[model samples]
Target: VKKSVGDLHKADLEGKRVFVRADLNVPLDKATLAITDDTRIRAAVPTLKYLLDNGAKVLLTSHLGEDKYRLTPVVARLSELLGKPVTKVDDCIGPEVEKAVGAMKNGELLLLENVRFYKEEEKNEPEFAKKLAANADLYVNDAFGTAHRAHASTEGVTKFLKPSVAGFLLQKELDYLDGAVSNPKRPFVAIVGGSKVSSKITVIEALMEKCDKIIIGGGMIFTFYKARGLKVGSSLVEDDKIELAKKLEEMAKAKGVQLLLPTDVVVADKFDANANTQTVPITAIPDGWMGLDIGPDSVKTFNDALADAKTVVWNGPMGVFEFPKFANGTVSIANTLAGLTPKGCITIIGGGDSVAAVEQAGVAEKMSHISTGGGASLELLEGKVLPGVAALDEK
Candidate 1:
């Protein structure tokens, strides 16, 4: 494990100003700018509370939405959750912001405006990073959602700040994701799905080397079907990735790993919630129909594969989970993972859709770990290092 907020003694933080890079990028109702979901905000609380309790002045930095997503709405929400007043600054970096930080007393908390307001943040410009790091004596990164990106707030500022460490949320993210990918229990199974094989190439390849079995679903299955010279009607298939799909299958075989593709799928006449649908074998899709979800038989096949697994990591949904008719596959898979957890199976769900599916199935708390960061979790499972995690002080 990397150095975390827990590693710091109270003496180390006493009378110090702490700059915390937190992922407060949450969904908002467009008209009111009111926070729709407080999950991300809630995730940041323990770290923030810990700093305050330990007598540190907290200067929090985060980027919400894009242009119109200001930090004003977050201050009230955070203040309510923390049971204390949170001060909000108008700008992230400037002499005025510096003066505000300078005036902060120990145990006080101040939230900076959206870092995305300045273009230099994404560019990792040195001047912007220096300005962000200038006001604080210590740095703590609690934003696992933005860990994959080396932005000024996440990684660049680490260069200017000494002894940067992971916050509670980031440490938990690493413990679950890194633990599952690097060293999992025997009979490790990986369930991967999504729209394109291109997006999951590195993840599939990495899992092929570590996992005992790999279950493939979602729209990417059509690409594999096309590789086998089958007509997939108007289903979502990557025409150019067919050869790469075939090569991946061969590589999985060469590595002595079992790769399971859907044998049957639920086909629809048109991409609609109320479309006419039928369950058919992968070999029997009609001319104008597209596969929207995996069939019952495929669900049974997936459940059977997961039945005896000790460690499992699932990313992406099994189908177009937005529609009620096509949500069965993803929901069933989530239930199956939940059922296995009590028998000592370590089930980890990554990606936003998969997490939503589990939550919709009412089995989110049943899983071993439900990752807070979708893209960051996928990058970690792909065996790639995260820039934000890399920048933290190592133990």
Candidate 2:
């Protein structure tokens, strides 16, 4: 929406210190210490390269492994991956780090340890934010994954620094997500799956207001079925939230929203993909067995719902996709979505497990947009303001 990064002067930080908040969180193999997934890191490369090439002394910062103030070996591994001699400052906000920033020169990059290294980062203390601002002439937020968090670096530092611009990754994310939510095509459909209803309640609530028909699958269907007074044995149910599910169903009926849940499921004796599985009615799941994925009939029902949709937004997997046995449901959905993309349908694949599902199905290229941030996208769908997007200057 703001054209491009070339249009943003961003506080005139030419030859000055630039503090760029980025998401470099990647999965690492604990046994081999090898980086497994670099999707998040790869997404930030364009923004990092931009600042470093623009004669700005770039100070990069991010959180890894959820450890606050504790130095982990994963931090060093990230430095090694960058192949740049990265110096780790002791604190995210301190006079010593400020001194280091002052001494930095063009083409030099310094990682400001871990911002989440301080508890104040998450608390978003004004003093801590001001301290972080002291080290830089400008701020660039490129951390789309953490954009939903109103942390000191993500939201607070913007007040202290002028011309806080959205980095390449963040800007692109805002554009796609904003378009999908605010200005979508007609007959919008949302496909929501996953293991827990608690995790997807907000998304469901938001979609109920926006989407035409909602196709629900995965183990979460059991919870809604249980809310209907059906017998769901060994199947996953948020026993605490059955009444809430019932209320949602009631609301859906009252609103005239066609909310479709799975009519059948592939029940299994174990959670593993290799478990003995059988198709069963949604009303009657057997004891000692769980519903790991949607049955073939349910898959057809889901695919049929999307046939008339001009826009589709999907997140999460339909089942235990890790194992080969239960991967069909997600894979079939991915193919169905891909098949419809070329026919003027806008299909967006939100990241996290859904991204993996699409990638595994080799249909990532077919979707109109594949979101890079899972939690950030969810927060946007929930109608909550994103710290990174809010920090940017509107065009």
Candidate 3:
């Protein structure tokens, strides 16, 4: 494991201005603008507290609620939670903002108005980056959630800053994800899912090189079926990528890889929680109906596929897990994955719906690692190196 905030140059930050970019895009109560779930917010506490205790002049930056170019009340609430008066700048990059941050003190926090407030932040314009970089002596990026983007705050500022480092959360995310992908235990199996064939095409192709078997579920299976010239009735199909799916199947075959798709599905009259559902072969969903989730038979089949996996990397839910009625497949897989952990298997639950499903199934604690960066983790598995991770101070 990589060293955390304790190993970073926290002591060197004493009385020095440290620009700490964090992911505090927490789920709000919506009605009252109160923080309903603080999971993302709480993740940054260790690094925040570390900076404060070390006597650094902390400058915080975050993008909340997609409020581009506008400072909202939700951003105002961050100060209330911290119990210290946070000097909220009107903009992330400007002459006035630079002057304000220039005068910051140790243990005092200044949250720059949302980084995404400016179009240049997303564009990574050089001038915009220099303005953001001018705020601090050093930079610490803790926003693992946004690590995939080469936005001005996350990546561009590094070019202008002298010493850009990974904060505790980013380091932890890299350590776990890197270990799971590169140096995992034997019999590495990856569970792949979600809606579109196009979305996860690269991820599946990339995993084929590393994993022993790729367990396929969710709506993407229809495309694969269509590629194989099978009759898929009313199931979600991607008409454009039939040939590419077939090509992928051929590649898997040539590579001697097991690309396991659901043998049966839980078909429903409509895509709703209360919709009437029935079991059938994956190829026979019938007209006017959709295959919402994997059936019981497919669950048993998947469990058998997972039986010998010494290491597992799972991304996305096994089925439409939003509704209780269709959540059975996801619940079953979660329980099975959790059971494998106690038997000495290393398991990683990659973010997105899989995180929600695992938490819903109450098996989050049973896994070895649950990724903080869902989209980032998925991108990494697609053989992409994160700029924030690549730019970190290496040992």
Candidate 4:
């Protein structure tokens, strides 16, 4: 385990200026500039609350939609949620931000402007990281969403700031994504899907060793179907990855792991919500059509596969869930996972599109965990190291 902010004593936190990097990159309406989603902001609250409650002067910094986007708009909502006022600075570093930090007192917070404004931030320039850490006594990274990127705020600043540690959210993310998934209860099932087999192959390979049954879905299934010498029609198929798909299946077979690919699919003559659609078996997609979603039979089979699952981790949506016509398969998976929690199943929505899928079903709260990370969570689940996490203090 990485040393957590909870590991710090009140004596160490009292009156200290703690640099907190959070993921407040919530979407804003283009015309109104009002926040469309506040999930990321809410995800960061507990850490800020903990720091303030312990009398720490919290210095919060993060990049929004990027340079054109500033952290100014986030102030009202964050402070309102924090039950306190948060002072804002126009820049993340330099004399102005220094003054803001100097003026801050314990139980108060200072929000730095978007760190992405500087070219040095993305480049991980050492001097810029030093400036980011200038007023901080410690570093706490709560931005699991951006943890895969070795940016100034996420990773570089850790070198200049002492006692760099994981915030409560980061700790919880690790506890479920890393700790729980790595050492799960019996009948562990990994449900993985996405558009490309290339993108999901590493994660599939990694999970094969840990999971008892691996259920495959989405456009990537066409690649596997192609590997089986089936006519995939105009469906999305990675021709170059066919060999690797076969390799994965053979490997799964050798290990005696129950590997599942969609037995049927919802086909569309054209890729649109109102397109001519048909539910067909996997081997029989007609020419000039694409498989958009797993068929009903596959959904029931997938749900049944989970009957004995004690720990279930889902990584992607089972279809192009954005289209109402092709969303049922994905929604079905979401609702199925929702029902499992009360039955003692540890269901983990392993981030990205799957999180959106569950949220779309209005069953996000039913799952055991819904990760805030996207690329970071996938990389971590694939057994890859995150630089932001790697830079933290060890337990």
Candidate 5:
């Protein structure tokens, strides 16, 4: 029932000072502050344009930086995208910033310095939050990447402003990551992977409640195999989670969810790209040799299971895809999901590693959604409500 940016008509937007919290932090090479990636900045533009085009004077705020965190580099890039110069202030709140805001005309934009510079921002101090809200008439949260946090910009300002609403990016993310998973099309399958079972335990349990099928992948598979009394060799396995793994499998069976694990694996004598590697069944692994990737057979099985999938959410990588040798399992899954997208399957790449895998595979665009936030997406999939999202106005 949350209100969205589209709900605000021209009257609500024109000639008003609108505060926008956008996730414009891009990966920068610390040495020169050269942006290594501008995707996050680009993702923030549609809403910015929407605001400006409708005659809203925008006061954009973000909180990640060093000179190192300065907004000048980001401002110049954002300006290039929207083809207009964006003003930047060294401070987020105060008389000087208020002066700059007072000087701005309608349809103009201003970018604030790293809000995290002020300890009060993260602490959500009321006075600081009120100062941030002082320069604006309303709030729009477009930073779904940090929506889980109750930081000053994300949550505190909402209390001091009216008509706080989610921007287009936040709305779309909810549709794919929350709505699609919550009430998915028939044959919804979840592909959960990563290095440890403990890390994904909560996500697994959450998905078990809603998904019709759950496909397991990554280094975590060793723990499940170990729980099944298979010889896991030198593979990454969580000894403490073995019993918990057994409990989860039983829970899946009781819930009547089809739980699929890789049947075979690509084992390595040493955890290195150049290490001697071999394919083996999940049961028979030579002692001291570890599994680095799922074998070709598991890839075939995973793709087959996804053949009828109408909605699929993939998180984590199937293997240590950093090594070219072990990259196939992860890349294959990305490629398969891209193929599924053309058939009307809502394929969502839900975490950092999986997003990198698809981008590495050169098929990122083919998937329905590649989430911008790793932790936020995981928390959402685990059925947690985001503080930033929860604070928005409801219709």
Candidate 6:
């Protein structure tokens, strides 16, 4: 974990200007260019409010969608959320940008235009990073979504700015994601799902070393079934990963990890949501049918395993949960986690789809931590160093 803003109490922030790299890359409508989701903006609140409340002048910078992810709408929304006016600059770099930041009051907030407006931002250009950090006394990174990237704003700027530290959100992300995997409570259960075994191979291998049990589901399970020479029917199986799947199962056993596969699945005649479906034993899938979701028996088995779990890390959806008809397994797992939360369980939803699954089940609030970065969170679980996080000062 990196040093956080809390560690900067010894550093004088009173009336000092602080630059914050926030993840405000929210979704925008194609035609309107208007902000569709303000979740990212809302996630940035605690850090921004902390700086303002502590008498520090704040300059918020972020990159939005390509071409013209303007900050005007964000400024308006942030102003309403912060209950204060958020001054906006025309651009992210240059004298005018510095001038606007320089004019900010002690407790005032200012937001710069999209950093991606300049190509140098993505290239991690030293001069551009220096220019962005020129006026700030210190830097704070609250953007966990971009923490995996070593871009100008996220990493390069830290070189020019002194005492660069993690913001509240970044610190919380590390605590839950890093700390949970490294030093988890007893009966740590990790749920690894999604479509391809190739994508999650490293994570599943790394998790075997720490987790007591690993629950496997989703379309990826078909590959494992194929490894065992079972009939997967027309299920979405990775033909190339069959051998690797067999190896992984062996590796899990060698490591003494309980690697659990689905006992039954809900199979469909076609890929469509309205296709005729049936629940069958894992090995009983017909040649013409494809498995779309986990069967009732599989759900019961997973819930039984989760009943005694203290820490649960869920990375992907059990199936194609975008279709309401096949969302049963994902919804059931989410509901189970929500029920476990009140009993001192730490349930984490890591991937975007799994996060959406829980939210779709109306149980997002019950999870201990729902990650904002999809690929970044997955890499963290795979025990990789995130460049933006590594750039921060160590405590």
lDDT at position 246, candidate 4: 92
The reply for model 3, stretches above 4 Å from the true place, is 1-7, 29-31, 69-105, 269-276, 283-289, 364-366
Every candidate's CA RMSD: 2.2, 3.7, 3.3, 2.0, 1.4, 1.5
RMSD of 4: 2.0
Residues 83-134 of candidate 6 have per-residue lDDT tens digits of 7788888887788977897778888988888888888989999999998988
Kindly list the per-residue Cα lDDT of model 5 for residues 183-204, writing each as its tens digit.
9997999999999999999999
Model 2 TM-score, 2 decimals: 0.82
Query: Over the stretch 326-391, how does candidate 3's per-residue lDDT look in tens digits?
Result: 888889989999999989888888867888899899997898878876788887777787876666
Clashing pairs in 6: none
Candidate 5 Cα outliers beyond 4 Å, as residue runs: 66-68
Least accurate stretch of 10 residues (summed lDDT) in model 3? 66-75
Which pairs clash in model 2? 69-117
| Candidate 1 lDDT by residue in tens digits, 1-395 | 67999999899997888999999888888899889988999999999999998889999999888465788878888998887779888888788888888888888899999888889999999998999888888899999999999999999999988789999999988887887667889799999999999998998998888889999999899999989999898998888999999999999999988999999999999999999999999999888899999999999999999999999989989999889999999999999999999999989888878888888888988998888888888788878889999988888
Instruction: Name the runs in model 1 displaced over 4 angstroms.
Output: none
Evaluate model 6: give its lDDT.
Answer: 0.88
What digit string (tens of lDDT, one per residue) describes model 4 on residues 97-192? Answer: 889888888899999999999999999999999999988899999999888899999999999998999998899889888988889897999999
TM-scores for the candidates: 0.92, 0.82, 0.85, 0.93, 0.97, 0.96
Task: Please give the ranking of all candidate structures by TM-score, highest first, separated by commas.
Answer: 5, 6, 4, 1, 3, 2
Q: Compared to the true structure, candidate 5 yields what TM-score?
A: 0.97
Q: Deviation in angstroms for 256 in model 4? A: 3.4
Report how far residue 391 has shifted in candidate 4, in Å: 1.1
